[PDB]
Design a protein around this ligand. Structure first.
Ligand code: HEM
Length: 125
């Protein structure tokens, strides 16, 4: 075993950082950059494939984790959500060509973050 919780929180933090450039663009605070968008989408898709291996049943009582017990009661659903994110991100990479398509396609990707957090992450801090 190892400190899997530190592992996952780090990768998940990277996903949040990855969405920043995109949110800046939506908020009109940054000029649309296709290279930056694709870089963030690729990062998100790659991390989504690494995360399914980082949620072992013995990592629910750390004291510094926001992962809810339900993850282990609905593990098939939880894993698939990461799969849905990866698939959505990879698809987005191919459909997002300009600012108009970013605004139009980014929701399907980012909607996954909320879907999981609603059921599997503790509201707090
Ligand atoms: C999707 C684009 C997405 C983002 C963005 C995202 C971010 C995120 C952050 C920033 C955290 C906190 C990490 C930290 O402590 O620094 C976090 C935490 C959890 N998430 Fe999330 N998340 C995104 C997607 C998903 C998906 C698709 C799921 C589940 C299928 C998911 C789950 C979780 C869980 C659970 C945590 C808590 C981790 C822990 O404390 O052990 N996220 N997310």
């Amino acid at each position: 075993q190892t400190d899997v919780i530190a592992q996952r929180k780090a990768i998940l933090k990277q996903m949040g950082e990855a969405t920043k450039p995109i949110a800046a663009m939506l908020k009109g605070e940054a000029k649309f950059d296709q290279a930056v968008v694709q870089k963030s989408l690729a990062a998100i898709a790659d991390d989504s494939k690494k995360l399914p291996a980082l949620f072992p049943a013995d990592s629910k009582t750390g004291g510094d984790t926001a992962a809810l017990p339900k993850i282990w009661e609905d593990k098939a659903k939880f894993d698939d959500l990461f799969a849905k994110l990866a698939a959505a991100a990879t698809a987005a990479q191919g459909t997002i060509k300009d600012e108009a398509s970013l605004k139009a396609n980014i929701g399907g990707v980012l909607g996954n973050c909320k879907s999981c957090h609603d059921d599997f992450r503790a509201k707090k801090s």
